[PDB]
Amino acid sequence: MEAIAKYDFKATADDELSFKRGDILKVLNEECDQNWYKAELNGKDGFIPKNYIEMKP
């Protein structure tokens, strides 16, 4: 599921990861979190807010 960061974000949590406005992630599932995805970047998978990205499945 093609992910696209709409804004500049930095991880808050330890299970979360950073992305800059424009990174293309890889949304490797979602479960219960109806506000957070579990996508991939920079060889690290982590939580990212659904409100900070524009998805395209």
């Binding site: 808050t12 949590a13 506000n35 957070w36 807010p49 659904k50 409100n51 900070y52």
Partner: peptide, 10 residues
Amino acid sequence: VPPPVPPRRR
């Protein structure tokens, strides 16, 4: 001015 991040509980 990016959005207010959701209150998570992961």
